[PDB]
Ligand binder design. Structure first.
Ligand SMILES: C[C@@H]1C[C@@H]([C@H](O)CC2CC(=O)NC(=O)C2)C(=O)[C@@H](C)C1
Lengths: 167, 51, 53, 122, 148, 185
RNA sequence: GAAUACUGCCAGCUGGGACUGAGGACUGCGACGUAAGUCAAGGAUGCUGGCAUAAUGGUUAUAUGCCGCCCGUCUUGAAACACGGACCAAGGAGUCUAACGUCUAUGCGAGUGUUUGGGUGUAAAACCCAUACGCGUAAUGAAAGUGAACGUAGGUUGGGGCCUCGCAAGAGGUGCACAAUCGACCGAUCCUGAUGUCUUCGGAUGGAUUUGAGUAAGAGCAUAGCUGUUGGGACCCGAAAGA
RNA sequence: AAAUAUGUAAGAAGUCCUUGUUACUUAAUUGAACGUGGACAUUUGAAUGAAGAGCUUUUAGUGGGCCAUUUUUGGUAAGCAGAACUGGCGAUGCGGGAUGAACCGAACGUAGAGUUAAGGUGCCGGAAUACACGCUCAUCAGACACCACAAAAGGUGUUAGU
RNA sequence: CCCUGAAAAUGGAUGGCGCUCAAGCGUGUUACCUAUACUCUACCGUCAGGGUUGAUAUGAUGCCCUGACGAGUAGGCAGGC
RNA sequence: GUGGCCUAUCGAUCCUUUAGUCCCUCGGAAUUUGAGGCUAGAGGUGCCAGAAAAGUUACCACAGGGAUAACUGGCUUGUGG
């Protein structure tokens, strides 16, 4: 024989796991994040954009839509740690947000065999975008310069210290 | 298997010392003390000021 | 000490049990009051230097 | 015991602990000497199994026998494993440790200032 | 087996267990019994006292066969009788028919008296016998007859 | 760093298993390891330790020593336990009817105990008929009767036997052993 | 008459940062709950995304930041301006034997040892064996010589274990080995000197600040192993010499 | 006539109460030594610690030392020679003293996080060109113990004081 | 405190550059830096204390629980290649 | 009262010799000389735990030693300047 033998072999029977005492208690948001607050996106393809915060979704994310007719940001999810909560506020008692939730934004089960070597928006998504934009735009127009404020991007000038700035 | 510190983890603090619940409930850590109006003798204050 | 200890133990057998046969070191002093009556505290600072030669 | 302390002055700092210091010390860093092993207290039944013959049946019973020097202080203290304190969090407050506390250092009897030192050292 | 020796464990270590200062040499303190009176004196005087000097008188042409006299004790005397007949002789402690024990054929010269034989008469034949030995055979009812 | 008041990593200094490779002795050690762990009887612990001993730490126990032990009043009906060999003795002319539990019996010792009317018992049968060592009597041989002990502690005025190869006159009975030749020891 | 500072306490509340996630059914201590259960209470889970390959990672070369003196030896002290070493391959130094000490394993044990030799053989093997002899079972003395129980093989103090009573704590009894001590016995030395008698022999009793490598219900013998010792070339190499 | 250093004791192998042995001792039924029997509790006779406490065999290497504080001898002195107690190096890495066998801190399995020691925070170089009160201007300033040096004397330089 | 006293030979040493209400001297208060040191966690090994047989799913020199510890020449022993 | 008021004033094995015990041995058996034994002293080793011991080498040899001298260098600076 090339190698003799192990006298006794380790058992192949997988052991179960101990009961884990970790209850999933709900998230505790920071005090500056209330619906209608204008947020600044710190990351993502829409970084630096001014957006209007609407709803806190079940998976701890934030549903947000800086009005698509204003700056082109649609209704989408964001992570609360990747945004800056400003002080300007927008009333939001004209939107209906119980329809939007996690399974609404669930993307797809991407087929592994589906690979693209060289290389459309749902009509239900665009209709919701229109409906919520109507209420949002109709209110922000009450107070001056908000539309242009939401249309412009955010950036740090020379000599800008975020550790002492206010947002 | 793991030493959990009291003075934190109130579950452990209550596993020991069942009296810590009563201490916290009645707020014995901020016991307001009864006022007494005794005054030092004139000889004590005189010698304290004395050079 | 053994003769006195035997007598104390035998006396404590009748009355005063747990007579504390053992010795003890010098304990720290207990509280006390120091009265000022007729004994007002008074002293001065260090004395300056002088030769005396 | 005062002669022992007077004989190891240059190597120790000691003082008079308060109830606050004693309670926090025993709760956080208190271990037992059970069968010559360092057993974390962590439970009232561990203490009552090794000190219940002396009328001590809880961690506050152990703390009581320490803060006030009871008849069974020697047995309770010898049951306690020596505390393994860490370096002070705010530092020693002194450029050089090895001078007497009166002479500006850190060793010697520091009266009631041991509470500030110990609470930072654990 | 050389594979169990400590030499196989000193391979790689310079001094091979013999020290770096002592520097294992040929014969540092002499050869054989050298210096039993000068520099090995303490070892002689402590572990082998009486080594040096003459004591007693000399025996020219000493033949060890003249002094041949193996001793046997009373507590071993009954072992010369065979085990099969030992029990039947021990019972019925007779004087008219007592066992005859011949220590010469058993290879012994003198019988000593470490004592406590059973109270059974025996006929003991021996070249020599100590005083207290014979007194115990006679106390047990037997007799000692001397042979040559 | 620690001010070590005693040697670190210090072994017990006692045998925790027999040095031998006797499979049957190992079986006995495993039987009495179970008994010592699972019973509170201190007889089991003593026998377990005594099974570990070396050949010179378990001297043979004579049948005369067994008989002498049986003469102790109240010990006549006890079982004699010898962790080691039991040897024959022709100096004793009567042997009581007893039971001896020993590791090994010499042929003469086995015959004599049986002839008296008793039986020779192995240690496993001892545990079956006495799991806690009820009414047992542990006997041990004389450790200091070895001829190796005579030379232990040799020194002046100690009264010990020197290590020698030949006895008699002309062999260490001279200067150092009499006043007539220098000094005496 | 207040406040504040300073010092101290809270089994007061609360925010941000970092490191760690060890175990792997249940058992425990708790807390909140009328209970049912739940829980941050004897060690991490849940949700999500990208990639699924050189992407992470290993190896290697390079660069960069910091550190890094030439190994071996003698030595109080070595990188030394102390000695050996230009380089590589192969060889190269605690071995065997006679006798022995402690310890360990083994077999039998008051015995132990077949192998000098004989029988036998499938033939330097294996198997079987008589008488002897070696060591032990008796010591002491220069020697001639003598030669080990007053006693449950002694008393005392401890002593594991066992037994009795006890729920227990403990109290009694027996107590191997072992340790300390005082006795008894054997040999030597010093002394005393009974019956008796080849009248110079015998040495009975009784003692001692004496002495033994002794007895006081034997432990040894043989084989094997590490280590140690002595003699041998003796861990290897090396004289100036002598015959 | 110190200080430091050093002997002994702080019990069960003890104490107390009765009374047995002897050839010693006493004028003696006196003592001495050793005992029989009985009594003594739970703080069994100060504190602290106890890592198990005792005992025995057998064998290695070593038997050139040196340094530091303090005591100290010879010498003018010596990185000189010779002693005492203790701690070290030899046998030992690590952080600091730039550098070093002995100094300061701390002694070492492999990693992670936190806090410190001795020492430091202009730059080299990680860390306050921090704060506060004063002194000094050197045409040879000074800048950390071991340590790598300076004296007697003098200066209407300047500052404080009698 | 500063200055005179104050002279040695290759060119050199508060470690260097440099420093003058100091980056010097005396003193004080804080903050901060980092050791193989201290604290907690993990792993390796050693040691000690233990658990485990109405068959421990027939390996009890196995498996497991708990605690502490880890410097090293000459040297000793053990487990291995 | 077991030498000097106390603290120093001294000597192994082997051999020789003396005193004592009248003792043991001369091993085929005895007697007597002789010799050898046992116990205790002396005769001596002063290098005093105790070999029996004259020089020279500028003709030299070996094993080593910086454990140790004859240069330099280093510490010191009595002496010198
Ligand atoms: C000087 C003279 C002799 C001397 C002694 O016998 C000399 C030597 C003889 C010998 O070969 N070996 C030794 O041990 C001693 C002795 O006894 C003295 C009293 C008398």
């Amino acid at each position: 024989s090339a190698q003799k033998a192990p006298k006794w072999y380790p058992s192949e029977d997988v052991a179960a796991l101990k009961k884990t005492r970790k209850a999933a208690r709900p998230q505790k948001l920071r005090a500056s994040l209330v619906p209608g607050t204008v947020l600044i996106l710190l990351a993502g393809r829409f970084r630096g954009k001014r957006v209007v915060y609407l709803k806190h979704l079940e998976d701890n994310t934030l549903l947000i839509s800086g009005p698509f007719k204003v700056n082109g940001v649609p209704l989408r999810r964001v992570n609360a740690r990747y945004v800056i909560a400003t002080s300007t506020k927008v009333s939001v008692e004209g939107v209906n947000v119980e329809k939007f939730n996690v399974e609404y934004f669930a993307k797809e089960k991407l087929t592994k065999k589906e690979k693209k070597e060289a290389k459309e928006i749902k009509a239900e998504r665009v209709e919701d975008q229109k409906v919520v934009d109507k209420a949002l735009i109709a209110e922000i127009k009450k107070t001056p310069l908000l539309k242009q404020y939401l249309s412009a991007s955010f950036s740090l000038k020379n000599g800008d210290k975020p550790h002492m700035l206010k947002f | 298997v793991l030493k959990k510190n009291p003075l934190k983890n109130k579950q452990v603090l209550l596993r020991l010392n069942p009296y810590a619940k009563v201490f916290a409930a009645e707020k014995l850590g901020s016991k307001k003390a009864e006022k007494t109006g005794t005054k030092p003798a004139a000889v004590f204050t005189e010698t304290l000021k004395h050079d | 000490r053994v003769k006195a200890n035997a007598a104390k133990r035998a006396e404590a057998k009748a009355q005063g049990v747990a007579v504390q046969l053992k010795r003890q070191p010098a304990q720290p002093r207990e509280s006390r009051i120091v009265s000022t009556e007729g004994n007002v505290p008074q002293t001065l600072a260090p004395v300056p230097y002088e030769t005396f030669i | 015991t005062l002669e022992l302390l007077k004989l190891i002055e240059p190597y120790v700092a000691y003082g008079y602990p308060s109830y606050s210091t004693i309670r926090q010390l025993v709760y956080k860093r208190g271990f037992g000497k059970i069968n010559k092993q360092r057993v974390p207290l962590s439970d009232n039944a561990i203490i009552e199994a090794n000190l219940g013959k002396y009328g001590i049946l809880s961690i506050d019973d152990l703390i009581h026998e320490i803060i006030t020097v009871g008849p069974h202080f020697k047995q309770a203290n010898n049951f306690l494993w020596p505390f393994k304190l860490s370096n002070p969090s705010g530092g020693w407050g002194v450029p050089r440790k090895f001078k007497h506390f009166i002479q500006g250092g850190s060793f010697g009897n520091r009266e009631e200032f041991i509470n500030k030192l110990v609470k930072s050292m654990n | 087996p050389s594979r169990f020796t400590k030499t196989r464990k000193h391979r790689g270590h310079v001094s091979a267990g013999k020290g770096r200062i002592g520097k294992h040499r040929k014969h540092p303190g002499g050869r054989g019994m050298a210096g039993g009176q000068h520099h090995h004196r303490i070892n002689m005087d402590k572990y082998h006292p009486g080594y040096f000097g003459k004591v007693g008188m000399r025996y020219f042409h000493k033949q060890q066969a003249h002094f041949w006299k193996p001793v046997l004790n009373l507590d071993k005397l009954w072992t010369l009788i065979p085990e099969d007949k030992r029990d039947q002789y021990l019972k019925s402690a007779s004087k008219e028919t007592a066992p005859v024990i011949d220590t010469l054929a058993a290879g012994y010269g003198k019988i000593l008296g470490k004592g406590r034989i059973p109270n059974v008469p025996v006929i003991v034949k021996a070249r020599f016998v100590s005083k207290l030995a014979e007194e115990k055979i006679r106390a047990a009812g037997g007799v000692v007859e001397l042979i040559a | 760093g620690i001010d070590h008041t005693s040697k670190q990593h210090k072994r017990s200094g006692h045998r925790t298993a027999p040095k031998s490779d006797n499979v049957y002795l190992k079986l006995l050690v495993k039987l009495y390891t179970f008994l010592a762990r699972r019973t509170d009887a201190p007889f089991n612990k003593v026998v377990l330790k005594a099974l570990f001993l070396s050949k010179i730490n378990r001297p043979p126990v004579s049948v005369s020593r067994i008989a002498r032990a049986l003469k102790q009043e109240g010990a006549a009906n006890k079982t004699v336990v010898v962790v080691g060999t039991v040897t024959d003795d022709a100096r004793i002319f009567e042997f009581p009817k007893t039971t001896v539990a020993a590791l090994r019996f010499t042929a003469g010792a086995r015959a004599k105990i049986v002839k008296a009317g008793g039986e020779c018992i192995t240690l496993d049968q001892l545990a079956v008929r006495a799991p806690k060592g009820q009414n047992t009597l542990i006997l041990r041989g004389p450790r200091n009767s070895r001829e190796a002990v005579r030379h232990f502690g040799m020194g002046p005025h100690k009264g010990k036997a020197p290590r020698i190869l030949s006895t008699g006159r002309k062999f260490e009975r001279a200067r150092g052993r009499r006043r007539s030749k220098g000094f005496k020891v």
